[PDB]
């Protein structure tokens, strides 16, 4: 699919930088003709077909074409797509209130509520994406933005599609590798993944939502892997001793090896504490 051509400059004004990730840069821009404000996602093509530096086509149009799925509160939507000789330019809603991970870091120590409160959000973004079959494959703090963040409690935006894939078929089989601390065993160990993969990512963000540290991180990243693939970890009583034995239970049901018995979004939604890359 191609998309819009003419220069960008002539129609957004660009600012701030955001972000940056994979091969990508993310700007503040204005649109001239109604000064809104949204996020411009500079996305680095590929210069030849065997070139490891660089986003392939097929990777850029798999992002774009999930993006214009989804209209939902919790998530990110897409404004619109230009490109030239050398970058896919993303226009998405702009969020202006950091990363979650920014916000944990700087606030150091979140009540049970104040985690809820995140987590009900992301576990409604994760059930519209889910019912839509769309596997996010890369859950994690830093994808989660927040609208404003100084409000008591801070309304959130799921991010970064960048390795979102369909799931038509049940599961997918390539090709798919978040950030070590995040990914479930069946990453690690490449097998086929589904929908269950994301349900593990987010037992890890409940994890550290309520404790300030991660469940399976190692100081290397091959330490991380073998703590993901054995599900070595632990609740310490340092961290957790007045976190609620129901949390606890929550976390203990999505951080489960086999994804057949992990707990589904549908799942977390009923649970009784709810309802009312890799290498060095
Ligand atoms: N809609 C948005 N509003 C505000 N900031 C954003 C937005 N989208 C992305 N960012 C910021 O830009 C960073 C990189 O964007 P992202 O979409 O994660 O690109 P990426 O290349 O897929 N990153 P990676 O997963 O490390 O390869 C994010 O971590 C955010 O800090």
């Known amino acids: 699919t191609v998309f819009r051509q003419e220069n960008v400059d002539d129609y957004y004004d660009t600012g701030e930088e955001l972000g940056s990730g994979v091969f990508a840069v993310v700007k503040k821009c204005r649109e001239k003709s109604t000064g809104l404000q949204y ?4 996305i680095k093509k590929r210069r030849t077909k065997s070139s490891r530096r660089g986003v392939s086509r097929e990777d850029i149009e798999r992002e774009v074409s999930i993006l214009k799925e989804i209209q939902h509160p919790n998530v990110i939507t897409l404004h619109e797509v230009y490109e030239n000789k050398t970058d896919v330019i993303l226009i998405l809603e702009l969020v202006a209130g950091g990363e979650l991970f920014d916000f944990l870091a700087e606030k150091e120590s979140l009540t049970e509520e104040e985690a809820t409160e995140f987590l009900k959000q992301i576990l409604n973004g994760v059930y519209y994406l889910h019912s839509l079959q769309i596997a996010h494959f890369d859950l994690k703090p830093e994808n989660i933005m927040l609208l404003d963040r100084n409000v008591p409690k801070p309304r959130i935006k799921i991010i970064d599609f960048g390795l979102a894939h369909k ?9 798919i590798f978040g950030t070590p601390e995040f990914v479930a065993p069946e990453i690690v160990n490449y097998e086929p993944l589904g929908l269950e993969a994301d349900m593990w990512s987010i037992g890890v963000i409940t994890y550290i939502l309520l404790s300030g540290a991660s469940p399976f991180l190692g100081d290397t990243k091959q330490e991380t892997l073998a703590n993901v693939s054995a599900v070595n970890y632990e609740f310490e009583d340092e961290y957790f001793s007045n976190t609620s034995a129901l949390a606890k239970d929550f976390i203990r049901r999505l951080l489960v090896k086999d ?22």
């Open 39 to 42: 996020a411009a996602k500079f």
């Open 167 to 175: 799931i038509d078929f049940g599961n997918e089989f390539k090709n």
């Open 259 to 280: 994804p057949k018995k992990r707990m589904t979004i549908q799942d977390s939604l009923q649970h009784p504490w709810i309802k009312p890359p890799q290498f060095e």
